[PDB]
Design a protein around this ligand. Sequence first.
Ligand SMILES: CC1=C(/C=C/C(C)=C/C=C/C(C)=C/C(=O)O)C(C)(C)CCC1
Length: 238
Amino acid sequence: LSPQLEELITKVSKAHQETFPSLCQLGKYTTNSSADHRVQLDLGLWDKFSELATKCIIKIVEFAKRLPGFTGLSIADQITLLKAACLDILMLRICTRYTPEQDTMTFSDGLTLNRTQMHNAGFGPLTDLVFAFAGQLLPLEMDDTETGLLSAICLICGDRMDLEEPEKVDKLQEPLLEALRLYARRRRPSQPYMFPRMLMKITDLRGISTKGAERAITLKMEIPGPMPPLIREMLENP
Ligand SMILES: CC1=C(/C=C/C(C)=C/C=C/C(C)=C/C(=O)O)C(C)(C)CCC1
């Protein structure tokens, strides 16, 4: 139904907004920690970072629980999808919080770190790639609903291994693909390549997140304690 599609767009949009404040709504604040230059790892920063990442994962789970039919999958599947797409979405999220002018990224509490600090916080040799991926997201000029829809598409993917009902997941993803094309084309009929362009960006995102996963490895060797529990759950995945 057209009305059905219109409401799916609103629901997803709202769940995204409610679980992820736009840069504009944030009371930005900074820190002086290792703003100087790049070091292997700033623990005070990784600490603030892992806390913000953990709270983010919880917000992603809340977002997933609010997508139509997610909650209808078996618990096994809900966890499988969450584990498999969580890093992707965490990456899409901070990359949409990037300010080209200041070359910064803002987290959900307003904490705004420059490139050096993102590096020092744990991104290590992967920070410039993340920043370059973020920069390449800019031309897409996506709004909160498109970002919300793109996220719902990354998460509800029936091609993950270990899925008990891939078929149900594929049926759930379908309307999301439709809502995004309709919405994207309605908003910008002047540029019909936006929809396939956003879709192709899913592939890029899966490439940076796999590199993010590799970074968690070396990072594990570098921190003085185990990584936060929810972060560990996320990184245990096929
Ligand atoms: C967990 C983790 C990583 C990525 C974190 C990301 C992508 C966090 C996003 C946070 C947001 C988006 C916070 C907020 O909005 O407050 C990297 C790649 C360093 C590897 C080590 C463990």
